[PDB]
Amino acid sequence: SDTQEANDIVTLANLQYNGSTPADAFETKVTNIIDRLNNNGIHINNKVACQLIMRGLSGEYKFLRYTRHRHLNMTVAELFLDIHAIYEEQQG
Amino acid sequence: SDTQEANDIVTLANLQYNGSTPADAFETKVTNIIDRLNNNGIHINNKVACQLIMRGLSGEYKFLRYTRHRHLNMTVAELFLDIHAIYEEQQ
Numbered sequence: 001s002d003t004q005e006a007n008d009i010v011t012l013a014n015l016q017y018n019g020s021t022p023a024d025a026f027e028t029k030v031t032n033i034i035d036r037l038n039n040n041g042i043h044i045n046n047k048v049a050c051q052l053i054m055r056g057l058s059g060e061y062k063f064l065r066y067t068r069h070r071h072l073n074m075t076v077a078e079l080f081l082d083i084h085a086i087y088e089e090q091q092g
Numbered sequence: 093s094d095t096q097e098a099n100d101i102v103t104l105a106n107l108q109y110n111g112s113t114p115a116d117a118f119e120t121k122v123t124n125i126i127d128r129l130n131n132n133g134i135h136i137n138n139k140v141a142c143q144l145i146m147r148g149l150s151g152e153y154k155f156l157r158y159t160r161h162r163h164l165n166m167t168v169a170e171l172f173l174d175i176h177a178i179y180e181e182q183q
Contacts, residue, residue, distance in 0.1 A: 006143040013105035041135050048134070051098040 005040050008033045012044070012052055018059035023087040027080045034076065046075045053079055061086060097132050100125045104136070104144050110151035115179040119172045126168065138167045145171055153178060 001007075012033050017026050030053060034044050044052070053076070054065040064082055068074070093099075104125050109118055122145060129136050136144075145168070146157040156174055160166065 003143060005140045006147065009101065009140070009144065010105045010147070013102045041137075042140075043133055043135075045133070048097045048101070051095055052101065055098070055102070 005037060005042060008037050009042075012037075014056065015053060016056045016058070017061065017083070019061065019087065019090050023080070023084045026083070030080075031076070047072075049076050050074050050079050057083075060090070097129060097134060100129050101134070104129075104141075106148065107145060108148045108150065109153060109175070111153070111179060111182055115172065115176045118175070122172075123168065138165070141168050142166050142171050149175075152182070 012030070015030065030049075034049055037044060050068070050071075054068055057064055061083060064079070104122070107122065122141075126136050126141050142160070146160055149157060153175060156171070
């Protein structure tokens with residue numbers, strides 16, 4: 001698409017996760033955005049990506065943005081492992 | 093700042109210009125964001141940058157997002173020359 005990169009950036013900058021969408025969908029959604037932008041030459045590294053993910057991460061997931069200060073060199077895969085583990089406990 | 097690039101992206105993705113802020117401030121604001129992101133490795137070329145500027149460009153500046161289809165290879169400097177010319181005539 002001619003307007004692909006712009007639409008991926010706007011989606012990435014306005015992520016809103018609370019626990020309604022399954023973690024499976026939300027992960028692949030963000031992972032695809034980062035991969036699509038990187039294929040077009042826009043590299044969003046782990047540091048900048050994690051910051052944008054934790055931004056808007058609300059509900060019972062708000063705390064991940066608080067502990068992030070101790071978490072530098074964090075990876076996107078690690079950040080989603082945290083979100084997944086919370087979703088598992090949200091189903092039961 | 094440790095959170096500079098992320099804050100630059102959110103600002104670039106939620107630009108809202110109507111004609112209240114002077115074009116001088118709005119131009120240097122966006123131009124600095126693009127330069128900072130390119131220096132940090134987040135390459136935002138003219139095509140994607142202009143698209144993001146025209147997004148949220150509302151008020152009497154809406155029509156620039158309509159003519160953008162005939163305007164390919166339009167540089168950021170060219171897009172602001174348009175915005176400037178509308179701002180000068182607005183007062």
